[PDB]
Amino acid sequence: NQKIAEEKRKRDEINMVKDAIKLTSDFYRTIYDEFGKQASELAKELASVSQGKQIKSVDDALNAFDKFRNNLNKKYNIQDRMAISKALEAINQVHMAENFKLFSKAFGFTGKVIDRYDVAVELQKAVKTDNWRPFFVKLESLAAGRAASAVTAWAFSVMLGTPVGILGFAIIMAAVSALVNDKFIEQVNKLIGI
């Protein structure tokens, strides 16, 4: 029966990769429908740059993200971030874990993937309080081997499960950029008119 189990393992990995690719194409198309063409292309470019690449230190990410924050807070207030965190409250944990596994497989993250819903809870807290250091520490900690693939997969798995609005989209993508590549933050700033 060892033979049959091994054949099933091979078949199941192949089907996992198939499901992952379909999930990413679907994700880009729903990003297109919900936030626009430029947002979809930004997500595509960021997921591309993330594959194979390594993340930055928490200090560098927090520097770029503090720039993004101080630009954001001059036009968007606390009611807006409260709306974002209330939207994040509606994440389905099982769906998020499965989407995280699939996105990790799709972006080249070969590490074993855990349900990291706690990072989403910390995201809610950080959006409410504008205190972002513990969130970034946890996000770095889930990136096994400093892999940006993991952080991009986690962000996409979070955004898939809820309708966060363009503001929450911009905030999440700006955090991912700060960890992966500051270059996108500028583009992110164009989505929310800043």
DSSP E strand stretches across the chain:
none
Phi and psi for 74 in degrees, rounded to 5?
Answer: -85, -5
Structure token pair of residue 164: 């966060």
Expressed in angstroms, the distance from the first to the final Cα of the chain is 61
Question: Could you tell me which residues come within 8 angstroms of residue 135 by beta carbon, excluding any fewer than 6 positions away?
Answer: 119, 122, 123, 125, 126, 175
Phi and psi for 108 in degrees, rounded to 5?
Answer: 85, 15
For residue 56, what is the DSSP state? P
Could you tell me the resolution of this structure in angstroms?
3.0
Question: Could you tell me which residues come within 8 angstroms of residue 67 by beta carbon, excluding any fewer than 6 positions away?
Answer: 185
Distance CA 38, CA 61 (A): 23
18 CB burial (10 A radius; 0-12, 13-18, 19+): exposed
CATH superfamily to which 2-191 belongs: Colicin (1.10.490.30)
**Can you give the C-alpha Rg of the chain in angstroms?**
17
Q: Are 60 and 175 in contact (CB under 8 A)?
A: no
**DSSP line for 124-191:** HHHHHH---HHHHHHHHHHSTTSBHHHHHHHHHHHHHHS--HHHHHHHHHHHHHHHH-THHHHHHHHH
**In 3-state terms, what secondary structure has residue 147?**
strand
CA distance to 54, 73, 140, 149, 158, per residue, from 66 (Å): 21, 10, 17, 23, 22
